[PDB]
Symmetry: D2
Subunit: 386 residues, 4 copies
């Protein structure tokens, strides 16, 4: 039995199991979910928490009076279930006003509005106890080369994130930003298309310590990149503030399959890296139950996300704890990889004849890496076949 508990820190976005099934070629196949029904259903399945866009919780252009009701109802369901809200985000993509972006709209008045909408939701996020605010610049980019000067757009992107960091430090809020990269869709190309682009951009912000990345499995796999490798770079930089778990079958539209579906082997190595690095953040699922399913299928899909995480975890632990795997890791010299190349300095390296002149290149070349035996042990553990 791989039932999830409140300590496993599994979370879901109101727009994940609430997805109505509208796609580029098809109408809604499910009615809208009450955020309160989702909180209750997720608690029953063993979720720890939910996340939201402003617009998922508060219908766009709500009065301040209605706004309160929606929040108080949500608050009640959280108090009843003990469900947490670790992360919130702004919808800067749905409303037609954002057709050219939020923070990097060519229209300056739209950029100003985008910021006012985000700040309003940061206040709410903090009242609900969220420690991470996500920015997904889903409309930040172009279909055509002349439509967007990317250097001016990155200036506007920087200006926006710095203004938000300023707001957060002036209010003394205890909340950090996580930028969520995506290479394309709904735009022909999106700015900060990958984990790398987003990490590089953060290093140019007034207050870089307030910002990290929220990488999504599917987003990196849409550019054909190794999601585990990107996560490893985000950890190496100390910038993995959040994660979005889902499935994707390689390079095509953003599928948002339940976690474990799509690239199962990458899902294995992902969980192996998160567990072995001791990532303490929430295990957030940003997935869409396919539009073929009714509400029973929606909850089965959500339950599968958590099950597949727990099954993969157990197999990754078994893999790492197996003495035959540890011997195989030494045979492949993963231990030598973890050792400094030249802790003796550069002078000692320049003087060491074993490092160049008297290096036996042919003897080193002939040493097998034994990576195939190691990978078959990983396969045997993943499949439970030893």
């Amino acid at each position: 039995n791989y039932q999830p508990t409140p300590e496993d820190r599994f979370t879901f976005g109101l727009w994940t199991v609430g997805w109505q099934g509208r796609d580029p070629f098809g109408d809604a196949t499910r009615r809208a979910l009450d955020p309160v029904e989702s909180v209750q259903r997720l608690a029953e399945l063993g979720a720890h928490g939910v996340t939201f866009h402003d617009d998922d919780l508060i219908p766009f252009g709500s009065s301040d009076s209605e706004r309160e009701e929606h929040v108080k109802r949500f608050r009640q369901a959280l108090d009843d279930t003990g469900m947490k809200v670790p992360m919130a985000t702004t919808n800067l993509f749905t409303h037609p006003v954002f057709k050219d972006g939020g923070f990097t709209a060519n229209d300056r008045d739209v950029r100003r509005y985008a910021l006012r909408k985000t700040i309003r939701n940061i206040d709410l996020a903090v009242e609900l106890g969220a420690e991470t605010y996500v920015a997904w610049g889903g409309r930040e980019g172009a279909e055509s080369g002349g439509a967007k000067d990317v250097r001016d757009a990155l200036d506007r992107m920087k200006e926006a994130f710095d203004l938000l960091g300023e707001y957060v430090t002036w209010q003394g809020y205890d909340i950090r930003f996580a930028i969520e990269p995506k290479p394309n869709e709904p735009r022909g190309d999106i700015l900060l298309p990958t984990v790398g682009h987003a990490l590089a951009f953060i290093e140019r912000l007034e207050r870089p310590e307030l910002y990290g990345v929220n990488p999504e499995v599917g987003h990196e796999q849409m550019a054909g990149l190794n999601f585990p490798h990107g996560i490893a770079q985000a950890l190496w930089a100390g910038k993995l503030f959040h994660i979005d778990l889902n499935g994707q079958n390689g390079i095509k539209y953003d599928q948002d399959l339940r976690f474990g579906a799509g690239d199962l082997r990458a899902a294995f190595w992902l969980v192996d890296l998160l567990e072995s690095a001791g990532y303490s953040g929430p295990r957030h699922f940003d997935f869409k139950p396919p539009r073929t399913e009714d509400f029973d299928g929606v909850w089965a899909s959500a339950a599968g996300c958590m099950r597949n995480y727990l099954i993969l975890k157990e197999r990754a632990a078994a893999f790492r704890a197996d003495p035959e795997v540890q011997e195989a890791l030494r045979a492949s010299r993963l231990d030598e990889l973890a050792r400094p190349t030249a802790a003796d300095g550069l002078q000692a390296l320049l003087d060491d004849r074993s490092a160049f002149e008297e290096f036996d290149v042919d003897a080193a070349a002939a040493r097998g890496m034994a990576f195939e035996r190691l990978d078959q042990l990983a396969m045997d553990h993943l499949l439970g076949a030893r």
Copy 2:
């Protein structure tokens, strides 16, 4: 006539027109070129310069006595032709000893050797007057998840680049490093797979000011990314120390077509961005004349790289100088994009009712971006159809 001159700063790698045509399924279709013949042939076509891997100039495991001869012969041809050497690089991929990498080989003795080989070639690079040293970590990565701990590998990557920066500052050399990203091939995944990953990594080096990126058109297009957008981010960060120009038909093996072939529209926007940013570095071609061609085809292919750059340049200039394009850029509000969102500060933004409360979202939403008319003007200029 779009003949190239010595001021256009066109350069070529000895391994570009020297490619013998060996591919994964096929033997060499051309004999090896004498580096001296390539220098002479490139000068005739109007090239400004050549670049080299250590191994292109000095056959692997040459005596110091032979090493000199090869260098003196090369030096003579450069002096005769007045051809420059603006960039040099190390071959850390061909020899079987590098089958698991150079700087991030699991084997510590291979990492030490990789560094000694690179340092030796930095000395030569400086003697030949190169101001940029390129690292292409072509063997840095894995085919399988357990073979490479990416965090340990990035530590070894950092250690290597810091040791090289230390060497360069201790010798008082006037040379900068450019890291060349690639997503895959010859490895299943390569570390620092994109411009973004490489920019982020540089920000963690002891001496970040000594390092930039050498992005390649084909490399970013192999991950399905917008090469112009990546170049714009590299410029915004002040990190475009070099560039590799070639062609690629989307997501597949590294084709290295002559510049202008593959994604012609991206080539147009690339030249438009390089020219309008006033990039002053060399226009370096890293391409492979297809293996179908003899030496006449090789030199036609090289000449085409330079021709296509000059033709694209002229069309991009005409595009930017055309009053109808300038009016179309204002209609699409590219000028508003270049204006600060809130130079009035955050307090003024929080107080401005036109930025939220009294913002007419529906009136802003209804404004067409007029991006299609702008893009058809760009198309008309590229095609010379106005």
Copy 3:
């Protein structure tokens, strides 16, 4: 001036210039277009004709009384403008009932309904003078392996197309079917994903002569395939009954850019092949004016489709008519490619010693193909740079 006349046979679907701009992450940015208005506007721009899905013309769940009002209004606009209707299609993707397909829905009663919906629209198509009925099995496929037995689905696919061919021969209708391949979106994988799969399936139908393909530029490029190559195979097989022209930037979601946008080179070679094969069918545009645009941008986008076709046509003709190109085609032995390999028969081939034992493989190997000089001439012509 690259003006479009009636002889150009340019066509557009109601759903193209009428796309409201709803995508998976955003609401409509434009109000709906009255089909009559679209007919009148497309006539103004120099279109020869329009195409429609049943549901574009007749709102889903219309009374027969309303049905006739919409058809009579449409009929009037066609009469007034002299616009033709060469092609019609069924919407078997939008309504939630089709979430698992039309012809290959797991639910037998949905398959039966899909057929009754299609047959009703075939009657209308013929009344309006259409000679081609298009089937786009957009919902035929799966997100998961257990959901769809592909052999059973192809039996149901075959059954459906044979029943439709039976109906058409019973009514003596003067109308042929064109199957429109697509690899994915909105399904994870779609059945008959390419031109090849659709051609192969047709050869197993009761009446193969009634069926061809309707290939779409963007659809083949979403699988990273060469659209000109696929079109050449469809022509070689005498199966190119229709074509859908648009733009796509490699492997990602279905973009539906205006023709000429995306892969400009492939657009050049496409027009070169259609013109030189004398394809006599309509030049149909299935594109979406991006959601950034208002109605002026919509009509500019449509006008650009036709403009870009006529520019490419002129440059391809100049290419083929240039004596230097014809000499270059002989140098690359395109004329030898057009000659039978062994019109002397198998026995003469087996007996010919110049064909094996007396074949100088090294002398043949050394012959350059001169493909690069030929391709630079094609580039010079496309760009108008000779």
Copy 4:
């Protein structure tokens, strides 16, 4: 223990466990294997058979005297081990003479030589008891549009295959052809890029019954296609004469990982389809032990191919035999998919009011497909987690 017996019909080409590790950017990492040794080692691991290119067995430009020495030694090893040779193929890609193709070389004398080379090896294939001759047109295609008229090339392709079918029927040989599709590499685009294109082409051959497809996992996945779907279409058409099993991580260069590696889910559904269709052909592995490995890694990699097939086979059987899965297949109406849509005929369909006018579209639309519960059961079985 998932041991491989002779009944498993596991096969491997000489070129698989004998790949020396040369790639576009690196030298050989392993010495050549004597074909005899490979036969002896593959028998030890529980292989049933081997396959070969002419050039793997007989070095190019061998005397007839040497030719017989290599064949007699090979023959002896087969006799000693009882290893079968079910399949043979021609090398029409390695030698520089094939730089523009074999059967569709622009040079007519190269096409003639290609045929004479193939026919010579068909004689050998039959002497060694092969029932399948594979054609991989690896050099059939282009890097540029002007280099190859695809209609002329398909005429030459047809001519070649018809001449070979004529030879085979004249000799009364008991041998069928399997065409092996590949989308690209080593050519920019290859002719017959997918299973669909190859099936469609076969239907235009003089003797279609002599020809089927040899689909490769990695080849279809390089175009981002569903390999199980393509295999199902090949079975539906009765054209699956052979199969090549390996691994591939989505859209990039041809990786040739061991079977099970790359897309593990697709490997599961593939084995599920081969087993449940009762495919009786050999399970042939066309893979490359990565160049990181020595000979122990080579044999581990080969053993892993067979192990991973037998694990998947066991999990697919358990999946299909599980009563909860059979109930879930009925809940998802896979049984309704297997029923004729209208065995009552077109007239009864046209007359049935439950099929249109009396069809409750909203009631049909509301029915969940329960595909997610079915897919989680498939996942649980694959992982051995029930």
